[PDB]
Amino acid sequence: ELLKPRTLADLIRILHELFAGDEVNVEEVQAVLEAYESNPAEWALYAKFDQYRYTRNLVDQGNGKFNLMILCWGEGHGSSIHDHTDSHCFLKLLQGNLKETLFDWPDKKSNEMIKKSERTLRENQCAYINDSIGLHRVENVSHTEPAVSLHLYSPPFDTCHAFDQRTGHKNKVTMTFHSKFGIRTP
Ligand code: NI
């Protein structure tokens, strides 16, 4: 059965149990990620801020089944429009809130991308997205507050496309990890 993670350690524990196979029960993953109550002292080692944009901080490589990671968000920090490389994507807020702008995959004309829905992901909630559903932008709308979000991606992926909101054009991007296991990694 799915047990409540009492700490980030206990959450890491269950995740390795959930992905101990070949498929993914997205349902149970989102409930337990949501069930772990964020404890700042437990994940502060991974939340390394960068003044300019957001960064990705690896927390656990999931024995190859997934890359768990934390992405701090300075005031005003946000992403371009992107996809998730045919893999699952879970995003749980550990601190603050984030704006999520949903978009459909562009047709083919060099047309503007109109949002298909938006929402504020709240501190401690866990959302999910995958390519079949559609794309999204992530943005910390705050002017004086930093956000921290815990992401789960399976299978792991480092490359993905960004999409221009005015044309639907796409470009491949190969993301990098700011830190790995509580160590800066230039
Ligand atoms: Ni995303």
UniProtKB/Swiss-Prot annotation:
* This enzyme's EC code(s): 1.13.11.20
Q: Which reaction does it catalyse?
A: L-cysteine + O2 = 3-sulfino-L-alanine + H(+)
Broadest EC class?
A: oxidoreductase
UniProt-listed InterPro entries: CDO_1, RmlC-like_jellyroll, RmlC_Cupin_sf
| Entry keyword Oxidoreductase | yes
Q: Under which pathway is this protein filed?
A: Organosulfur biosynthesis; taurine biosynthesis; hypotaurine from L-cysteine: step 1/2
Hey, what tissues is this thing expressed in? Highest expression in liver. Also expressed in kidney, lung, brain and small intestine.
Q: How does it assemble?
A: Monomer.
Q: What is this protein called?
A: Cysteine dioxygenase type 1
Q: Which organism is it from?
A: Mus musculus
